[PDB]
Symmetry: C2
Amino acid sequence: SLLPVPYTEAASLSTGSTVTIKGRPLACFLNEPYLQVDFHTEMKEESDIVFHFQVCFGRRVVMNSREYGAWKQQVESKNMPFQDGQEFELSISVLPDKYQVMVNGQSSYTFDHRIKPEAVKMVQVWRDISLTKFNVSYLKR
Amino acid sequence: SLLPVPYTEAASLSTGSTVTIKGRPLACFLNEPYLQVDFHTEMKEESDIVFHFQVCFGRRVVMNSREYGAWKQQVESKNMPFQDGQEFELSISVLPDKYQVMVNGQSSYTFDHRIKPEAVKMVQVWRDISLTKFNVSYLKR
């Protein structure tokens, strides 16, 4: 929609940071659109990924990290709070021990830190969505 | 790029028809962009799919049909003629017994007809590509 997709923003994260995303799938869930959010260690798209979050709408969510070019241990969830045909609000909070993903206000996934969040330099949001809002908060020391 | 993605065009197919697509992946192959081409039986995106062609660039290709709302027997290929970071030219020829997919001029996949190609009313091209050319030929009786 308003923001370009794939969407890339330079970013820094630490405990207390929140990444907020508002968007809509580009296809009905029968057609299995995807959503992906990657927290990268550099601006380059081939850089390592501290937190990879990939939704296959209506089916499953996979989370992982990519470290020195290699994918690590995948975490697979069948939790599916996203609603067919609807706009979603996604919040990703940086807690001391993990990322916490809220979907439409509901805690829905968490992922323990494998790499310190301070390693993040870029966030990419892409695949089969339109994006109307993206924000990273910067209020904490 | 120039054409909107997801790209939808009303279409009719019969023996001798060719669907030609020129585009570029939106991500490096390390990030596993997808490409999908679906031949639908109606203009509605939830309609049945006579031919579903889904590339995970650098990894695999899956082909299938969706008949009365249900996916049928998946065909999986590890053939990967697509080149990292490059524009591709995809041709899909309607032969009497099958679809034949050419990638950059090279025969790369085929899929036997499960539903007559005359059932097609729409083609959708979507997922992680930009599109510069789309054509369906209409030269044959």
